Amino acid sequence: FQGWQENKSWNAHFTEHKSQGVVVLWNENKQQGFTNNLKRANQAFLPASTFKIPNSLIALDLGVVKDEHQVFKWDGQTRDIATWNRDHNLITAMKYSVVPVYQEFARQIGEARMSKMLHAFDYGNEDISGNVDSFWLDGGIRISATEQISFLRKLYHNKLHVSERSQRIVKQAMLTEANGDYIIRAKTGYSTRIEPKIGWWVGWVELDDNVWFFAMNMDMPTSDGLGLRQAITKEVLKQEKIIP
Numbered sequence: 423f424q425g426w427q428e429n430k431s432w433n434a435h436f437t438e439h440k441s442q443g444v445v446v447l448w449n450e451n452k453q454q455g456f457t458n459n460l461k462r463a464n465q466a467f468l469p470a471s472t473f474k475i476p477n478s479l480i481a482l483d484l485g486v487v488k489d490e491h492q493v494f495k496w497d498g499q500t501r502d503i504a505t506w507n508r509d510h511n512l513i514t515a516m517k518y519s520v521v522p523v524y525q526e527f528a529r530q531i532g533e534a535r536m537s538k539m540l541h542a543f544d545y546g547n548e549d550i551s552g553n554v555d556s557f558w559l560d561g562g563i564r565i566s567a568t569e570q571i572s573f574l575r576k577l578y579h580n581k582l583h584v585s586e587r588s589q590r591i592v593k594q595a596m597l598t599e600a601n602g603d604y605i606i607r608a609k610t611g612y613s614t615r616i617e618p619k620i621g622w623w624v625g626w627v628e629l630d631d632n633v634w635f636f637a638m639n640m641d642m643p644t645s646d647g648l649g650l651r652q653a654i655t656k657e658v659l660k661q662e663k664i665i666p
């Protein structure tokens with residue numbers, strides 16, 4: 423581990439949007455990491471919907487989710503996010519960060535197996551204190567941007583302690599963007615229930631000959647700025663010549 427190079431010039435991308443945050447990048451081929459803020463890079467927050475990555479893996483490996491086509495019917499309760507008020511499969515539940523679908527996963531996984539799996543994953547502080555169906559939103563689990571990278575690297579290489587199939591399905595469900603230059607597999611998150619409210623974007627960029635892992639979070643006082651998670655990350659990615 424060569425350490426983490428700090429590149430403060432990326433702060434310009436946050437300041438441009440009156441925002442504060444961190445982007446962490448990991449060059450897989452060179453085993454080199456870069457961040458604008460070495461301190462915040464290692465600060466552990468609630469994972470919020472980025473927890474849908476480990477939650478999906480566990481649900482799949484325990485057969486709570488059979489495959490990416492299985493339909494989880496809307497419970498008929500109207501919630502404030504319109505896309506949640508419909509039937510979902512794993513693909514669309516990830517895409518739209520459909521919390522109630524994953525809360526039901528968590529309840530079926532159960533506290534004991536959830537704890538053991540997060541320890542097996544070496545995920546964050548491995549603490550699931552709180553409600554079994556909400557701890558990643560308002561309980562004890564905390565993970566930093568650099569810890570997200572470590573976890574994502576295991577998933578990329580199929581090294582997590584679940585089946586290869588489970589890891590392949592989750593990486594399929596993380597698909598976010600692709601073109602002839604790059605593929606982004608990622609997961610957003612918006613931690614709102616405990617201060618400070620922060621937005622997440624974690625994942626990686628696949629190139630022909632390299633993979634660049636990333637994890638960012640940023641202060642997010644309102645949902646108004648949620649698009650800045652991807653916008654700021656892409657500005658860093660383009661400055662670093664990762665995407666055109």
Ligand SMILES: C[C@@H](O)[C@@H](C(=O)O)[C@H]1C[C@H](SCCNC=N)C(C(=O)O)=N1
Nearest residue numbers: 483580582583584585586587588589590
């Ligand atoms: C061809 C078969 O062997 C193959 C299949 O699905 O048909 C099995 C082999 C491993 S088993 C789970 C990981 N092993 C852990 N010790 C695997 C998987 O990890 O998805 N599937």
Ligand SMILES: C[C@@H](O)[C@@H](C(=O)O)[C@H]1C[C@H](SCCNC=N)C(C(=O)O)=N1
Nearest residue numbers: 470471503519521610611612613614645
């Ligand atoms: C509030 C939490 O449930 C939060 C999370 O679990 O991380 C939800 C809300 C937004 S998706 C809809 C956008 N929300 C407000 N505009 C979000 C995400 O950005 O991933 N997941």
Ligand SMILES: [Cl-]
Nearest residue numbers: 593594595597
């Ligand atoms: Cl894919």
